[PDB]
């Protein structure tokens, strides 16, 4: 039998975080909001929806600055460059567009995806964008020459998520074939495969200060440690298709569930300090309750969620909350926890 640790320090005691509450709901999109991108100076954010428009909203007012057209299918990705005045969109129409924000016009196309594109990440230090789609491939594109410099193959399902970080593993692709692949960017080879999830991996995120990441499939979130992909912990209790995941600079994991569910977790301990259920915009069906995309702003004080009732919901953490009003209900249980 593999030995466990009986020190009772393997379970960190959760830090206290205030609960989150609804602040805003922004209408105007005529499709499910599936993209969201806060610009690096925290002034505006970018929503892409099923009405194939990209809308630029002021973050402070929630007030519609601009609408950009040019896609013909649902916008799935969006990225405001911190080093260039560029925005990056991908869609279900196989198009990966680079928008010049100084002209509000599409200036580049990154062509080569055989099907609709679901994800798009900018490399934090290199001049590279990464897309994944329904063709089972993560395309790694050079920004300047529009050249598909890497074809990351090995997944047998739709590549649904992807993260770029500055150290190896530089690409992490979660796919609907229930596997997660860790990719060395320099060679285009799989460093590792994680097959712990039973269902299609739909959400990934990386921690801002720790060298760890998290993956999420239905009913299960798993925290892993880079660069070896060692299984760190489970986030448990969100029995839904999890589309999204948002960790904060203050260690908050946000899982949004396709049935309209929400879980706010403490990152280090795995404790669920909040469990919410979103509400639908009037006129919606019960089936239209669902958080389809989410992000934090650069401050981390606002959670932006795009939801399948075509809405934008801003969430603030409660300023009138103290550790006495919302006590941590976690105890160091002594259970085998059959793995």
């Amino acid at each position: 039998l593999v030995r466990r640790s009986e020190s009772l320090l393997a379970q960190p005691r959760p830090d206290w975080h205030p609960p989150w509450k609804l602040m805003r709901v922004i209408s105007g999109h005529l499709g499910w909001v599936r993209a969201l991108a806060v610009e690096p100076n925290n002034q505006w954010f970018a929503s892409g929806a099923g009405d194939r428009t990209i809308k630029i909203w002021d973050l402070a007012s929630g007030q519609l600055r601009l609408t950009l057209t040019g896609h013909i299918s649902t916008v799935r990705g969006l990225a405001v460059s911190p080093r260039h005045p560029y925005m990056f969109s991908c869609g279900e129409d196989k198009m990966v567009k680079c928008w010049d924000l100084e002209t509000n016009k599409v200036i580049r196309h990154y062509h080569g995806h055989l099907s609709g594109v679901y994800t798009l990440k900018l490399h934090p230090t290199l001049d590279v964008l990464v897309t994944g789609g329904r063709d089972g491939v993560a395309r790694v594109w050079d920004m300047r020459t529009r050249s598909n410099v890497h074809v990351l193959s090995g997944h047998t399902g739709t590549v649904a998520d992807l993260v770029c970080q500055e150290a190896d593993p530089q690409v992490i692709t979660g796919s609907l074939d229930s596997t997660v692949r860790m990719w060395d960017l320099a060679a285009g080879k799989t460093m590792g495969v994680l097959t712990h999830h039973k269902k299609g991996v739909r959400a990934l995120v990386t921690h801002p200060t720790e060298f760890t990441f998290a993956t999420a499939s239905t009913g299960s979130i798993k925290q892993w440690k880079c660069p070896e992909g060692a299984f760190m912990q489970n986030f448990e209790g969100h029995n839904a298709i999890i589309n999204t995941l948002a960790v904060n600079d203050q260690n908050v994991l946000f899982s949004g569930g396709d049935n309209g569910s929400m879980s706010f977790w403490d990152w280090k301990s795995g404790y669920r300090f909040q469990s919410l259920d979103t509400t639908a915009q009037p006129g919606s069906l019960d089936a239209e309750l669902g958080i389809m995309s989410s992000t934090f702003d650069m401050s981390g004080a606002r959670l932006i969620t795009g939801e399948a009732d075509k809405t934008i919901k801003i969430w603030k953490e409660d300023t009138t909350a103290t550790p006495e009003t919302h006590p941590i209900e976690w105890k160091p249980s002594l259970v085998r926890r059959k793995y």
């Binding site: 593999v2 466990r4 960190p12 410099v149 150290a167 097959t195 712990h196 992909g229 912990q233 489970n234």
Partner: protein, 144 residues
């Protein structure tokens, strides 16, 4: 057949079969345990790499991707006429071994290797063959 530290037949040679040594393969129940609870595990370093390692990896990866960009740009638009008259020779010191029966030590050779002058008007010589895909890399154990 190998043995492990405590002494049992090691079965990780089956999961690692067909893969290199730097490949990360989870193949035992020990990979299903949390790192904090994983027996011989005290302090765990969960810090990002420093700016030195980050910039070194950035240099290495951007050199590799720059080579790929150069190849892709060469393939995307050829330079009209594909000739190069700067045909600098390469010299090779070739020491022959023994072959075809006889075992006498032949004298070692100095070989001048020059690229051949190609007709600038010549079209591509050979057709492109559609060969089916090879088998994938050996799949990992399913760690449900």
């Amino acid at each position: 057949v190998q043995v492990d530290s405590e002494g049992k037949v090691d079965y990780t040679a089956i999961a690692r079969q067909g893969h290199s040594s730097d490949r990360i393969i989870h193949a035992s129940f020990k990979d299903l345990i949390p790192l904090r609870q994983r027996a011989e595990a005290g302090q765990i370093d969960l810090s990002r790499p420093s700016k030195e390692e980050v910039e070194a990896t950035a240099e290495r990866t951007k050199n590799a991707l720059a080579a790929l960009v150069s190849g892709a740009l060469a393939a995307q638009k050829p330079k009209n006429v594909q000739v190069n008259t700067k045909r600098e020779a390469t010299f090779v010191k070739y020491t022959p071994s023994a072959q075809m029966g006889n075992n006498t030590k032949k004298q070692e050779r100095i070989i001048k290797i020059v690229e051949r002058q190609r007709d600038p008007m010549e079209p591509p010589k050979f057709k492109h063959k559609k060969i089916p895909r090879g088998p994938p890399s050996p799949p990992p154990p399913v760690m449900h």
